[PDB]
Structures are given as C-alpha cells and as structure tokens.
Swiss-Prot record:
The record marks 105 as: Causes a bend in the G helix. Monomer. Heme b binds at residue 90. It comes from Glycera dibranchiata (Bloodworm). X-ray crystallographic analysis indicates that the D helix is absent, Leu-58 replaces the distal His (of myoglobin E7), His-90 binds covalently to the heme iron, the F helix has several more residues than in mammalian globins, and Pro-105 (G7) causes a bend in the G helix. Transmembrane segments: none annotated. Belongs to the globin family. This is Globin, major monomeric component. GO terms for molecular function: heme binding; metal ion binding; oxygen binding; oxygen carrier activity. Keywords: Heme, Iron, Metal-binding, Oxygen transport, Transport. Residues 1-146 form the Globin domain.
Length: 147
C-alpha cells in the first residue's frame, strides 16, 4: 500500500505530469526509451521498433490508465480490481508472453520520462512515492496477468 503522505505527493505531481495531454507525451518517451534500451522488447509488444507509431498510441493509453489509478489510490481494493482487469486482458496482448520481470525496467523509464517533463518537482520524495505507486499499480496488473 501507500501512506497518506505518498498518495498526496503522487496526486499532486500527477497534475504536472498530465500537463495538457493527459500524460500522452510522457507515455511516448517512456515506451520509446524502454524499447531503444531493450531492443528485444519490441517483439513482446507487437512493434517494429521504437519508432513504430503504435508506441505513441500505447504510451497515451498506459499513462491515461495510471491517471485513473491515481484518482482511485484512496480506495486500494478499487484500484487493484481495475488494474487486475487490465492485467487479465494482457494475457492476449503482444507476443502473448508478457512476463512479470519486464515491469521493473519499464518502471524505471516511466520515472525518467516524468522527471523529464516536470524537472525539479520530481524530487527525492516524489520519486519514492511514485516508485511505490508504480509498484502497486503494476503489481495488481501482474496478478491479473497470472490469474
Ligand atoms: C512491459 C509490460 C507491458 C507490455 C508488454 C504491454 C503490452 C501491451 C500491448 C501489446 C497492448 C496493446 C494491445 C492492443 O490493443 O493491441 C497493451 C495495452 C494496454 N496496456 Fe499494456 N503493456 C505493458 C505494461 C503496461 C502497464 C505498466 C500499464 C499500466 C497502466 C499498461 C496499460 C495498458 C492499457 C491501459 C492498455 C490498453 C488496453 C487495455 O485497457 O487493456 N500496460 N499493453
């Protein structure tokens, strides 16, 4: 779970991460940099590479879903139940062999993309709160995936 102070930091900085595009730009950079750094991951997603137009499209949907998860952090069972449902759908996505291990490096590129957009606001406490928030959001998707 998250402490009240962590949910408050996540909720507050999400407003700047969302910007004017509901975080779409952050999603594009996240997935872009992740596949560039890990080339064998293009095949796990159904993409040709980091430049595939599907990267920008999926990047927007990933970040729009985190915005929904952020609006529900105060009710943990609610947030977990909807991320599990996202997770059950992932059984049939990409190469259909999405693994739990892949979410840990993806989380690192997500925090990097966020910091790229909001700069100094993504301080030490913001990074810890978001590493914790990403741990629970992705943790709940993985449990849907392995259900
Ligand atoms: C490295 C792990 C991941 C892989 C390989 C992956 C792969 C995919 C693929 C291939 C699709 C597109 C399916 C299609 O419509 O053709 C998809 C959709 C989606 N992914 Fe993931 N994904 C990953 C992580 C995440 C994370 C961390 C989130 C969390 C917010 C997420 C949220 C979504 C959402 C919201 C969709 C749109 C469709 C739906 O709601 O099920 N994905 N993902």
């Amino acid at each position: 779970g998250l402490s009240a102070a962590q949910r408050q930091v996540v909720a507050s900085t999400w407003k700047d991460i969302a910007g004017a595009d509901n975080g779409a730009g952050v999603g594009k950079e996240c997935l872009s940099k992740f596949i560039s750094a890990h080339p064998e991951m293009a095949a796990v997603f159904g993409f040709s590479g980091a430049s595939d137009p599907g990267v920008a499209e999926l990047g927007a949907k990933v970040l729009a879903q985190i915005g929904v998860a952020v609006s529900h952090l105060g009710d943990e069972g609610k947030m977990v139940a909807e991320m599990k449902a996202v997770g059950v759908r992932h059984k049939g996505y990409g190469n259909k062999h999405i693994k739990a291990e892949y979410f840990e490096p993806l989380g690192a590129s997500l925090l990097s993309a966020m910091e790229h957009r909001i700069g100094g606001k993504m301080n030490a406490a913001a990074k810890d709160a978001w590493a914790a928030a990403y741990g629970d959001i992705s943790g709940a998707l993985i449990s849907g995936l392995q259900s």
